[PDB]
């Protein structure tokens, strides 16, 4: 059940709005890129 956190926090890669990802700080971007590669 603990898997529910990332089901909401990390939407499918194909659904990410590029303009939203670009508005994030660089550290947040790297944190998200790293999390998507571990899926």
């Amino acid at each position: 059940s603990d898997a529910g956190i990332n089901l909401i926090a990390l939407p499918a890669f194909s659904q990410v709005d590029p303009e939203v990802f670009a508005a994030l700080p660089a550290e947040l971007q790297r944190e998200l890129k790293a999390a998507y590669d571990q899926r």
């Binding site: 926090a9 709005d17 947040l28």
Partner: protein, 76 residues
């Protein structure tokens, strides 16, 4: 006034706020609509991560502005 909160998908959440509202107050309104605890919410404006103790006017967030919402991943 009205502001917009927007996730990684572009999902948009409309909020009624005042410039004196703190960032914690905004995350509380977000919890009322989305059911996400405020500690797991990260709000971003002008490329910077916003601090809960400050207000919208402290960050020069005016009417019809867009804040970006990124939830915390598990563990963090």
């Amino acid at each position: 006034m009205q502001i917009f909160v927007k996730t990684l998908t572009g999902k948009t959440i409309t909020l009624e706020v005042e410039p004196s509202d703190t960032i914690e107050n905004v995350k509380a309104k977000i919890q009322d609509k989305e059911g996400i605890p405020p500690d797991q919410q990260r709000l971003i404006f002008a490329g910077k991560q916003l601090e809960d103790g400050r207000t919208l006017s402290d960050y020069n967030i005016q009417k019809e502005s867009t804040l970006h919402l990124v939830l915390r991943l598990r563990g963090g």
